[PDB]
């Protein structure tokens, strides 16, 4: 029902080996649709979903111009942040920016976000109201003062509440077959002895979309959170996702254990049993 559009930007310095590497990707929900890579030959924003290919030359020229301007600002940022933190040229550093907007089932704006990180830690982010900033440390207060004096939040709010939402709706319509689907998980559990007295129980969810899902184990109805190994949801490569959860249990106790799967494509949450 609910949807999101997000753009992700990463710039990495490589001291003594040229200009920083810059990569940008855009997603609608869990489906990537565009990319730009500074090291690639084309120097264009490029399509990565079939439904965005129909956008005309004005779109690709405009997105390429904007993504290059993003690349140039993040390039400058790497130098600026080295100054703010009194760092040398001995090492590589990373800047990340992500922004975008969420809508509900009725495609009306829920909230917007714009967040920046330096060396893998929060640096500065727009607050939920889109009118003020959260700065994580003293160096980010400097950026906050500069961005308040330049009225950055007013410009971002306008984009996030207006333009971002309008284009998300356009993409949801044009890419409806891909984007407005739900593929319910195909589920099962597997059982393998690890010794003569213990077995691994693994609960599987395959071929689902969107990626959000919950898998949990219970023993006599009690959650087994601390004893569960839960892997990161992973792409199958075809537009759907996979995930599993496992527990190691004493042999003979299998019937006490149940796996529980929740996903938006299921009419009801599933309970899988060994009896």
């Amino acid at each position: 029902g609910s949807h999101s559009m997000r753009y992700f930007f990463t710039s990495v310095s490589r001291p003594g080996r040229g200009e920083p590497r810059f990569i940008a990707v855009g997603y609608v929900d869990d489906t990537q649709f565009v990319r730009f890579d500074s090291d690639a030959a084309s120097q264009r924003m490029e399509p990565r979903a079939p439904w965005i290919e129909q956008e005309g030359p004005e779109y690709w020229d405009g997105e390429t111009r904007k993504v290059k301007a993003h690349s140039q600002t993040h390039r400058v940022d790497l130098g600026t942040l080295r100054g703010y933190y009194n760092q040398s040229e001995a090492g590589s550093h990373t800047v990340q920016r992500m922004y975008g907007c969420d809508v509900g089932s009725d495609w009306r704006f829920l909230r917007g976000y714009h967040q920046y990180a330096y060396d893998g830690k929060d640096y500065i982010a727009l607050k939920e109201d889109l009118r003020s900033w959260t700065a994580a440390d003293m160096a980010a207060q400097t950026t906050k003062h500069k961005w308040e004096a330049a009225h950055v939040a007013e410009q971002l709010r306008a984009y996030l509440e207006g333009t971002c939402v309008e284009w998300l709706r356009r993409y949801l319509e044009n890419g409806k077959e891909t984007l407005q689907r739900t593929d319910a998980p195909k589920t099962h559990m597997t059982h393998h002895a690890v010794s003569d007295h213990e077995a691994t129980l693994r609960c599987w969810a395959l071929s689902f979309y969107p990626a959000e899902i919950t898998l949990t184990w219970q023993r006599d109805g009690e959650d087994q959170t601390q004893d569960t190994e839960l892997v990161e949801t992973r792409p199958a490569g075809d537009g759907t996702f996979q995930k599993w959860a496992a527990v190691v249990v004493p042999s003979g106790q299998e019937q006490r254990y149940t796996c529980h799967v929740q996903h938006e494509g299921l009419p009801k949450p599933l309970t899988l049993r060994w009896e």
Binding site: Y7, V67, L81, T143, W147, L156
Partner: peptide, 9 residues
């Protein structure tokens, strides 16, 4: 992408 509001830190 945003065409405004993306500034240097």
């Amino acid at each position: 992408l945003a065409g405004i509001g993306i500034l240097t830190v």
